Structures are given as structure tokens and as C-alpha cells.
């Protein structure tokens, strides 16, 4: 509906969560960059492991208070991921290592966000 | 004729001097294949280009053509992916450098 | 001053010496490419250690024969650094090593100019 379109734009939560639809968008953009493996491979792998969790985190929202620091951070981390694959076309050869670290941090954060 | 077709690709690749696989690896070994490509044309009537060996040389010589032509658009992330592409073309071309034209001539 | 604006255009000296002002534009420009360490880290380090020498040259220029190998080549090397850093937006990914060799060379020359004793004129 509406928040589904907000999710396409990269906004994961507006006092309600559509994390599942946002993660699908991020996965589909990162899948496009076959040759950059930190995206196409590592991130798209660890993101795909979280897609089921987000599916459930979408069917059961009232029970949880997304106010919790960890829950807020999950949206924040998923939006960080979106703004990072979206800008990959504009990333310069000299920014490879800088950009790779960023993608790796977004990778690490997302994993510990499944230890729960 | 296709000695000419090797020249146009020897020409384009030499222009990108800083990228060694093109300017120091491929063009080094398109240069050995150059006298031989010339000889093939001196013998065009006698030889049958229908032969598998010559057919492949046409295919590799254009495979090389597409790669050098498309270089200006290879993005930094596509580097290693591209370096194998041409270093696999540079493989097939080196082994073409070690052929007996006389053997094919004898085989009609 | 008009002299400082000339330093900004990449001029190191007209009659007057402006080594320290020009060397700061080149530090600032080099600082813009934070991700490219040979520029933003390696070169800026050397340039910062050269900066006090240039500052002294600028204050005591009334007393220096600027027609000497050492002072002319310093000025020239600072200018060499300027066009080398203004040129980075146009180096392509397959040129990284050539550009790095160019910068490493300027870096070397700029370090060597730190040995200068300003008193020996």
C-alpha cells in the first residue's frame, strides 16, 4: 500500500514496520552488482538469512515495542544498507576500501541482529 | 583478409598504455601472431578457412576485438573479471602462434 | 592580497615569494581526497613537515638570492605538486600505479627540500 511505497524509497519504519519489503529492495539492488562480491556475495548472503526474521517481525508487531534500542537499530541498520547499495554506482576507484569497510560493518551489525 | 583485422585491434589496445594486460601482454603476443596472420593471407587461395583451426582464429581475433573496444567502459569493480577475459584470449592466441601453416596447406 | 590570489591560481612566486601560501592550497586540495592515502596521508604528511621551512622562506625573502638552484626547484616542486593534485579527478582506475609513482616522486623531492639550511643562503 502506502508504507510499501515508502519502503521502496528506503524508509523502513514510520511508526509501523515494513522491514521485509525494504530488505527485498536492498537485496534486488545488491544482486545487480555481480562483479562486486562484498555486495553481490557477502551482503546478499547475510541479508537473505535475515529476510525470514523480517517476514515474522512483520506478522507480530504490536507485541514488541520497536522503541527498544536494538529494534530501532535494526531499521537504522537496514536503511544504512539501502543508502549504501544505492550509491555504489557513484563510488570511486579510490573509495573501494573505504566503501568495502562500510559494507562489512553493515554486514556484521545485521548478523548480531539475528543472535536474537 | 584478416591480417588487417589483427592490426585494428593491435592499434586500439596499444592506446591504453597504463593497463599492462592490454599494452604489455596481449599486444606483445598479437605481434607474434601478426607475421603468421600475414602469411595466412599470402596463402588464402590454397587454404580452406572452413578448417576448424582457422575458424577458431577468426572467433578469437574478434573476441579480442570486442574486449579492447569495450575497455573504456570497464568499471573498477569489473577489473579482475576483465583481466581473466583478456588473459584467456591471450592464452588461445599464444597457442595459435605455434601452428604449421604448411601442415594445413598439405591437408588442402 | 593579489599575491595570495596568485598563490590560489597555483603561482608560487612572481617577484615575491609565496611558497607557504601556495603550499597550503596544495595541502588543502590534497586533503579533499581522504580515501586516496598516497595523496591525503603520505603526501600531506611530507607537505606539513615542509610547511615551516616555506613559512621561514616567506618571512626572510628580502635576504635570499631566489636565483639559486635550491630555492627555484622548491618553488617549482610546490607548483609541480599543485598541478599533480588538481589532476587527480581525471586519473582512471587503470592509472592508479602511474599516478602513485608520480606522487611518490614529488613526495621524495619535497622531503629532500626539508634539509635546506636557510642561513647558508
UniProtKB/Swiss-Prot annotation, chain B:
Protein name in the entry: Probable disease resistance protein At5g66900
UniProt remark on domains: The LRR repeats probably act as specificity determinant of pathogen recognition.
Organism whose genome encodes this protein: Arabidopsis thaliana (Mouse-ear cress)
Domain RPW8 residues, every copy: 1-108
Family: Belongs to the disease resistance NB-LRR family.
Function: Probable disease resistance protein.
Coiled-coil regions, chain positions: 35-71
Disulphide-bonded residues: none
Amino acid at each position: 500500500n502506502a508504507m510499501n511505497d515508502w519502503a521502496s524509497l528506503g524508509i523502513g519504519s514510520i511508526g509501523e514496520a515494513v522491514f521485509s519489503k525494504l530488505l527485498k529492495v536492498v537485496i534486488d539492488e545488491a544482486k545487480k552488482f555481480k562483479a562486486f562480491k562484498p555486495l553481490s556475495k557477502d551482503l546478499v548472503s547475510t541479508m537473505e538469512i535475515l529476510f525470514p526474521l523480517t517476514q515474522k517481525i512483520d506478522s507480530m508487531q504490536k507485541e514488541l515495542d520497536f522503541g527498544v534500542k536494538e529494534l530501532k537499530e535494526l531499521r537504522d541498520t537496514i536503511e544504512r544498507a539501502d543508502v549504501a547499495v544505492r550509491k555504489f554506482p557513484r563510488v570511486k576507484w579510490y573509495e573501494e576500501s573505504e566503501y568495502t569497510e562500510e559494507i562489512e560493518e553493515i554486514n556484521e551489525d545485521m548478523l548480531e541482529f539475528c543472535q536474537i
